[PDB]
Each structure stands twice: as C-alpha cells, then as structure tokens.
Amino acid sequence: SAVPFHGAHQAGIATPVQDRLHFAAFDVTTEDRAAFVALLKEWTAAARRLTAGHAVGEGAYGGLPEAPPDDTGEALGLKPSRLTLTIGFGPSLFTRFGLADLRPEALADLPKFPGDNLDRARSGGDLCVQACADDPQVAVHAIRNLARIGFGKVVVRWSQLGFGKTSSTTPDKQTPRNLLGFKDGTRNIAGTEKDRLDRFVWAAEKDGTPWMTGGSYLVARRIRMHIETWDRASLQEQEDVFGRDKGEGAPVGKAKERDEPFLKAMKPDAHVRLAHPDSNGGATLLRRGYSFTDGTDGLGRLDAGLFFLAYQRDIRTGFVPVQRNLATDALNEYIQHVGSAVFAVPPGVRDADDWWGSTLF
Amino acid sequence: GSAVPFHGAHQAGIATPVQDRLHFAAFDVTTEDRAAFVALLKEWTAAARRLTAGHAVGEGAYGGLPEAPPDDTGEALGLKPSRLTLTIGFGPSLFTRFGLADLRPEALADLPKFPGDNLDRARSGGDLCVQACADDPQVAVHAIRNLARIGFGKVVVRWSQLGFGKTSSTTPDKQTPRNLLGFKDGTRNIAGTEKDRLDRFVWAAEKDGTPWMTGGSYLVARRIRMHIETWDRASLQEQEDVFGRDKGEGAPVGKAKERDEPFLKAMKPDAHVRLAHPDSNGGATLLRRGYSFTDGTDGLGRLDAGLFFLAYQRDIRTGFVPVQRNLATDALNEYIQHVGSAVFAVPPGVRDADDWWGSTLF
Numbered sequence: 001s002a003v004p005f006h007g008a009h010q011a012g013i014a015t016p017v018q019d020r021l022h023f024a025a026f027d028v029t030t031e032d033r034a035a036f037v038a039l040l041k042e043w044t045a046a047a048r049r050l051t052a053g054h055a056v057g058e059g060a061y062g063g064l065p066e067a068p069p070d071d072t073g074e075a076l077g078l079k080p081s082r083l084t085l086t087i088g089f090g091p092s093l094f095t096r097f098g099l100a101d102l103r104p105e106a107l108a109d110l111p112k113f114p115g116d117n118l119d120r121a122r123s124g125g126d127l128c129v130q131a132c133a134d135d136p137q138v139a140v141h142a143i144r145n146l147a148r149i150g151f152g153k154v155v156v157r158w159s160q161l162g163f164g165k166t167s168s169t170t171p172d173k174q175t176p177r178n179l180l181g182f183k184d185g186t187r188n189i190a191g192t193e194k195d196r197l198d199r200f201v202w203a204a205e206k207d208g209t210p211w212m213t214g215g216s217y218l219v220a221r222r223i224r225m226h227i228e229t230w231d232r233a234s235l236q237e238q239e240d241v242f243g244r245d246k247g248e249g250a251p252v253g254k255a256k257e258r259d260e261p262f263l264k265a266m267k268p269d270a271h272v273r274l275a276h277p278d279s280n281g282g283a284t285l286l287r288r289g290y291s292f293t294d295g296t297d298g299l300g301r302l303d304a305g306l307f308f309l310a311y312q313r314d315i316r317t318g319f320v321p322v323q324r325n326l327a328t329d330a331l332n333e334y335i336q337h338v339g340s341a342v343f344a345v346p347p348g349v350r351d352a353d354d355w356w357g358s359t360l361f
Numbered sequence: 362g363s364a365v366p367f368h369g370a371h372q373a374g375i376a377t378p379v380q381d382r383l384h385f386a387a388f389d390v391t392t393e394d395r396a397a398f399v400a401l402l403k404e405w406t407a408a409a410r411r412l413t414a415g416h417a418v419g420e421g422a423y424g425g426l427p428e429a430p431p432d433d434t435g436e437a438l439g440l441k442p443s444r445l446t447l448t449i450g451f452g453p454s455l456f457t458r459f460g461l462a463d464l465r466p467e468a469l470a471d472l473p474k475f476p477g478d479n480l481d482r483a484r485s486g487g488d489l490c491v492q493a494c495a496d497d498p499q500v501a502v503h504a505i506r507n508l509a510r511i512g513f514g515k516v517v518v519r520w521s522q523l524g525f526g527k528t529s530s531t532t533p534d535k536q537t538p539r540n541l542l543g544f545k546d547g548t549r550n551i552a553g554t555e556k557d558r559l560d561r562f563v564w565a566a567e568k569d570g571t572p573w574m575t576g577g578s579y580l581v582a583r584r585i586r587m588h589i590e591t592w593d594r595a596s597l598q599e600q601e602d603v604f605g606r607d608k609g610e611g612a613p614v615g616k617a618k619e620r621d622e623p624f625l626k627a628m629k630p631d632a633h634v635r636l637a638h639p640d641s642n643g644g645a646t647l648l649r650r651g652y653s654f655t656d657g658t659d660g661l662g663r664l665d666a667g668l669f670f671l672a673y674q675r676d677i678r679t680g681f682v683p684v685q686r687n688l689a690t691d692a693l694n695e696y697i698q699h700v701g702s703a704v705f706a707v708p709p710g711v712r713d714a715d716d717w718w719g720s721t722l723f
C-alpha cells in the first residue's frame with residue numbers, strides 16, 4: 001500500500017510499476033541559488049508527507065479560517081496508493097546557479113533522429129517530477145501541490161497523464177498490452193535484478209560524476225501512435241512489424257511469450273530484432289513507460305500513444321545507440337516522436353535530514 | 362471487476378454505480394442512408410454485448426485469416442469486464458435527418474444562453490454520443506475505439522472527453538469522492554436504489570408526450586474549467602462559504618456529519634448548495650454523474666483542470682435549466698467557466714438479444 005521514500009536510490013525506478021502516472025516538467029523562474037535550495041528542502045518535506053498518505057504542511061482543513069489550507073485536499077480519504085515521487089534535473093538547469101561545470105557528461109543532448117517531429121512546448125524542462133501511483137487522483141494531487149508550493153520559483157512547462165495496468169483486476173504476473181494490442185515489457189530489466197541494475201541503470205562513482213553516484217539518467221519521449229492506420233493493417237503485417245505474434249507474444253517460431261527470440265527468424269527491420277541488446281553491442285535499458293490517450297485531435301483521430309520512459313546508466317550507451325538502430329524500424333510507419341526530454345535523476349534521500357539534490361547543492 | 366448486465370428496461374450507465382473512469386465521445390453522422398444507419402445501430406449493439414461481457418468483438422483479436430485486419434483491435438485481451446457500461450444518446454441535430462423531424466422530443470430542449478458561458482463549438486453538440494464508463498481506462502478506450510472503427514464511413518468522432526476520476530455517486534453507502542476543489546461531490550444525489558425518485562425525476566414516461574422515449578432519460582453535458590490558481594489562494598473560510606459545507610467532513614454548515622440535512626438559512630445567500638437545492642428550485646432534482654479531468658497545462662505555467670459535468674433528468678426543461686438559471690448569482694461562478702455543452706436523448710434499454718439501440722425510434 002505504500003513504498004518507502006528513503007533509500008540509497010530514489011524510489012519509482014526499480015520499485016514495482018504502479019498503475020498510473022502523472023509526469024510534469026518544470027521551468028525554474030528564480031536566479032537565487034539559496035531560494036532554490038530552500039524550495040528543494042520544502043518539496044522533500046512535502047514528498048515525505050504525500051508518499052505516506054498524509055496532507056502537506058498543517059493539512060487540508062482545521063487551520064485558521066482566514067488562511068488558505070496548506071493542502072488542496074482532493075486526496076483526503078485516499079490511501080498512499082504506492083505513490084512514488086522521483087525528481088530529475090534537465091541539462092538547462094545547469095546554466096543557472098553557477099552549475100555549468102557540474103553537468104554530467106552522461107547527461108547528453110539527444111541527436112536529432114530521422115522522423116522526429118518534436119513539439120517545442122512539450123519538450124525539455126529544467127526539472128521533472130515523476131509521480132506514479134495506483135490511484136490517478138493521488139498522483140495528480142501530488143503534482144498539483146508541489147507546483148503550488150513552488151509557485152514563484154518554478155512553473156509547470158508540460159504535463160502528461162499515463163496509465164498501465166489496473167491492478168485491482170489484472171494478475172500481477174501478466175504482461176500488460178500497449179495500445180497496439182501487443183504485450184509490452186517481456187524482455188526488460190526487472191527491479192529484482194540487482195546486478196543488471198548496477199551494470200545498466202545506476203550511475204557509479206568511477207563513471208565520472210560523484211554527486212550522481214546511485215542516480216540514473218532518464219529519457220522521456222512522447223510517441224504518438226497512428227491508431228486508425230494501424231487498425232487497418234492485416235494481422236500478419238502487425239506481427240511482422242514486431243517479430244512476435246499478437247495473441248501469445250511469442251517470438252516468431254516459438255510457442256511461449258518468454259521463449260528467447262531467434263533473431264534470424266524475424267524480418268530484418270522487425271522492432272524486437274533492431275531493439276534487442278545483441279543488435280546494439282549489448283546496450284540494455286530499463287523501460288518504465290505508460291500508455292496515454294489524451295482525446296481526439298482536429299481530424300477525428302485518437303490522440304493516443306506511448307509515453308516512453310527509459311532509465312540507464314549513461315544516455316550515450318543506453319538510449320542513443322538503440323534509438324539510432326531503429327532508423328529503419330518497420331514500426332516507424334505507425335508512430336511519431338512528438339516530445340522529448342532528458343534528466344539526471346539524483347541519488348536517493350538517505351534519511352529524515354536529507355533532501356532532494358543535496359549531493360549537487 | 363465483474364460485468365454490469367447490458368439488457369434492461371433502461372440503459373445501464375445511469376442509475377448504475379459510478380465507475381472510476383470515463384471516456385465520452387460525440388459523433389456526427391456522415392451518411393444519408395437511413396438503412397445504412399440502422400445497420401450501424403444493430404452492429405454497434407452486437408459489439409456492445411461482447412464488450413460489456415469482456416469478449417472481443419466480431420471473430421476476435423487474432424486467429425483469423427493472416428491477411429485480414431483483426432475484428433477486435435486487441436488491447437483489452439486478458440482484462441476483465443471492469444464494470445464497463447455503454448450508454449448511447451441522440452443529439453437534437455440528428456432529427457434533421459432520416460425523416461425524424463416529427464419525432465424529436467419536446468423534452469429535448471435546446472439550452473438557452475447562460476451568463477458567463479464561453480462555449481467552444483468544436484467541443485459542443487454532436488449528432489449522438491456514447492458514454493463509456495469502466496474501472497479500467499484501457500477497457501473504456503478499447504470500447505470507444507472499436508465502436509468508431511465499426512462506424513467508419515457512417516459516423517465520425519466530433520469530440521471526446523476522458524474523465525480520469527469520478528466526482529459523483531449513485532451509492533450513498535459508499536465513500537463520496539472529492540472533486541479537484543477538494544470538496545466531496547455527490548452527497549445529495551439520487552441513489553440507484555431509490556426507484557421512486559428515479560421514476561419521478563429521471564426516467565421519461567409515456568404520458569410525458571414522446572412514446573419512443575419511455576424508459577429513457579435526457580442528458581446534459583457541460584465541460585467546466587476550474588480557475589485553480591484563483592481557488593487555491595482563497596482562504597479556507599471563503600471556500601467553505603462558497604459551498605455551504607465544510608471542507609473536511611463535508612457537513613452542511615453548522616452540523617456535524619456529511620449526511621445531516623442542510624439547513625439552508627444558515628448558508629450564505631449565494632452559497633452553491635443553497636441555490637442548487639431542490640427546495641430553492643420548486644423541487645427540481647437532478648442525477649449528477651460527472652467526472653474530473655486534466656488536459657495538460659494551459660501554456661501559462663499552470664495545470665489545466667476542470668469537471669466534466671453530466672446530469673440525467675426526466676425533462677431538461679424542468680431539471681437542468683431551472684437549476685442552472687438559479688445559479689446566476691452562485692458564488693462558485695468566480696472560480697469556474699462553462700466551455701462546452703451538449704444535450705442528448707438517451708433512449709430506453711435494449712430489452713433482450715433481439716433488440717437494438719434506437720429500435721423504438723427506428
């Protein structure tokens with residue numbers, strides 16, 4: 001029902017994947033380092049309250065009638081709902097407060113990729129807060145109240161709601177399906193694999209940026225799907241695009257979902273074949289994305305897709321090589337990357353006296 | 362995660378307990394052939410019988426001929442019914458087609474202009490709607506997508522709205538949810554058990570004038586933006602004064618418990634509850650069934666929030682209209698703006714496996 005907030009790492013990376021997401025990117029409006037550190041301490045205090053299911057500050061009610069309540073109160077009577085709050089720092093943060101020389105080399109700018117159609121307004125950001133929870137209202141209340149506490153020092157640049165499984169009805173051992181109808185997450189880094197997390201996910205001291213030890217690097221891509229076009233493709237076209245069948249999710253030529261793929265039996269530009277670590281010099285990612293459906297655009301079409309989130313030890317050796325190899329993905333016919341951001345996710349809050357970003361500031 | 366029965370005298374999705382998630386879509390008709398449109402309705406009813414039971418539509422999501430697109434798009438495979446309901450409604454503009462003019466109900470009244478209205482015509486109106494409600498948002502999206510797919514060439518989606526969480530209740534024995542202003546929403550609604558109150562206030566009767574609508578209801582949808590920056594800097598007392606209930610318990614002002622009956626004379630003259638209460642409105646009573654929404658930022662550094670308000674009633678002219686007219690002086694108006702609007706006639710229920718949506722009209 002709750003996920004511990006303190007740790008060597010921030011929660012919400014290797015911890016069990018919750019049903020819902022509210023991702024927000026913030027821009028910083030203050031030039032004052034001290035004022036920003038002050039806000040980081042205030043946010044951390046609020047995150048401790050929120051992730052334990054408590055109201056922020058002195059509560060949603062019961063205070064002085066002539067003061068506004070410390071907490072906006074729409075999460076009253078709800079449970080912690082496995083809420084995790086994960087903060088990250090964008091490269092543009094490091095142009096402020098004199099931090100230019102503290103930017104990790106692993107926090108690399110993404111190249112432009114063939115087919116990119118990035119909306120400037122829904123890309124970038126000085127920092128982000130990833131709020132995951134099984135109840136969407138818990139997640140929204142967290143973002144709503146952190147933005148309020150930070151008003152004057154940060155504004156919300158863009159925000160994305162997402163959903164995965166609904167746990168109260170779907171088995172825990174069942175792979176969820178993306179909105180193309182295919183199981184998603186079969187061959188992924190699991191939070192139980194401590195050795196693969198150390199190798200592929202967590203920043204280490206010898207990687208070159210000490211304040212980032214125990215952190216990770218996050219890539220966010222908002223990927224629209226062309227739903228109506230996908231849905232007119234033959235069942236055989238859809239399965240050819242991925243290299244797995246739609247019903248079971250088994251790699252072509254095998255019968256069970258978790259059978260290891262034979263890549264030579266897949267089409268040369270199949271998505272699994274091009275994404276697999278064997279085709280990328282061993283490059284392996286922790287995917288932790290969520291589906292989205294925002295409504296319908298001006299042409300009647302479903303505004304829906306995958307809010308892709310990948311964690312890795314170094315952007316230069318994780319996301320970049322794999323996405324580069326997708327240049328000829330048969331999937332590119334049906335998707336468009338329309339938003340993008342990268343963030344350095346600092347190490348965990350170690351105890352009650354620690355705070356978000358203490359190793360950097 | 363069980364199924365809600367699809368057949369009945371009335372459509373499910375109204376007196377039914379309010380499910381966690383909403384996906385509501387409005388459709389414009391693009392065919393002149395009434396025979397084709399009836400065929401659509403029959404095919405949509407068949408799909409909905411599968412969908413509400415947790416089955417894939419048509420011949421399924423896989424296993425068919427490799428070279429054909431599958432009948433069902435597949436993303437609900439292995440999910441339970443999740444209490445899915447599908448409720449269809451007919452807009453006033455529909456009756457300009459297929460020779461239906463003489464059949465448009467009197468109780469399908471167009472809404473007048475209300476003060477403060479800033480309505481977007483792109484997210485308003487619609488020849489018909491489908492309200493998909495479920496506890497699993499993938500289940501709801503899958504149902505809308507597959508209905509639209511089946512209707513390609515005969516209908517198109519005009520506008521849609523997802524509600525990420527409910528702000529209404531038809532089950533007073535369960536916890537009342539809160540809206541994004543932080544107040545419980547749904548305390549004094551109509552309960553799906555109050556059969557006599559639903560007959561009097563919700564279900565259309567034969568005597569009312571339009572025989573094909575007997576057993577149906579009428580739907581008012583209003584998309585309402587909330588000024589959360591303005592709200593969130595108001596004092597606790599201002600917020601409580603605006604509604605007439607306290608924030609914590611949600612009790613009428615002066616009383617201890619959420620479900621104690623309000624004493625209206627103790628509320629401000631412009632309090633929302635005081636002005637909305639049936640006693641202030643000649644007995645006018647509504648079934649509220651709305652959902653909260655957030656659609657990103659506003660581009661100005663703030664979250665965008667609102668309430669997708671849905672009211673069912675026996676007659677728009679004696680339900681939503683008089684109550685909304687009485688909210689002209691509502692203190693809540695300082696914090697909200699109506700920006701989308703639509704009315705629909707919700708026909709009677711699909712009686713059995715041989716019946717179909719709209720059969721009593723067509």
Ligand code: HEM
Nearest residue numbers: 178182183184185186187223272275276277306322323335
């Ligand atoms: C709409 C966008 C995408 C969809 C629908 C999608 C879907 C899938 C599916 C169905 C699988 C097979 C099941 C699984 O192992 O999870 C898969 C595998 C994978 N995908 Fe994607 N994908 C998308 C974009 C991306 C992107 C942008 C990347 C990285 C840049 C990526 C990297 C991977 C990786 C590493 C695997 C595991 C391959 C393996 O080791 O077998 N995917 N994806």
Ligand code: HEM
Nearest residue numbers: 540544545546547548549585634637638639668684685697
């Ligand atoms: C964002 C817009 C609105 C918000 C936040 C809101 C909120 C509330 C709240 C907090 C209550 C008290 C608890 C309850 O009994 O449900 C309430 C009651 C009520 N509201 Fe609203 N409301 C909104 C719009 C409307 C509109 C547009 C109407 C009708 C046109 C309406 C009609 C009513 C009615 C009939 C009651 C029950 C009063 C009673 O019988 O005691 N509300 N509303």
